Structures are given as C-alpha cells and as structure tokens.
Design a protein around this ligand. Structure first.
Ligand SMILES: [Zn+2]
Ligand SMILES: [Zn+2]
Length: 64
C-alpha cells in the first residue's frame, strides 16, 4: 500500500502530466514528457504502451 495517500505535496500537470508527492522532486520538476501512448492503471501501476490491450484490461476490471 504505502500509507494514507491523498493530494498533499503532489502537483499533477495538465500538459506534461508529471506527478510528484516528493517535495524534492517538485524542486527538480522538469516539464517535458514525450507521452505518445502510455496508460497507467491505479492498482496495476505498470504502464501499458497500447490502448487496445488496455480496453481488454478494463474488461478484466468489469464485474458480471
Ligand atoms: Zn510538469
Ligand atoms: Zn488494471
């Protein structure tokens, strides 16, 4: 898990989409992200480089 997580210290950019809860990483925050096709899943934090398998992966999160 990690602990009691919520929007505290974290800046989430709209354009570069970089997100850091670590205050040191906001001081080192460098806006410039080549974000072609990458989708992070909340629980399965490993990023998917494809949209189609991601859609089938959401079907895996869908109940009956
Ligand atoms: Zn940024
Ligand atoms: Zn997932």
């Amino acid at each position: 898990a990690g602990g009691a997580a919520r929007p505290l210290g974290e800046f989430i950019c709209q354009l570069c989409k970089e997100e850091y809860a670590d205050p040191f990483a906001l001081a080192q925050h460098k806006c410039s992200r080549i974000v072609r096709v990458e989708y992070r899943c909340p629980e399965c934090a490993k990023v998917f480089s494809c949209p189609a398998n991601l859609a089938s992966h959401r079907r895996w999160h869908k109940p009956r």
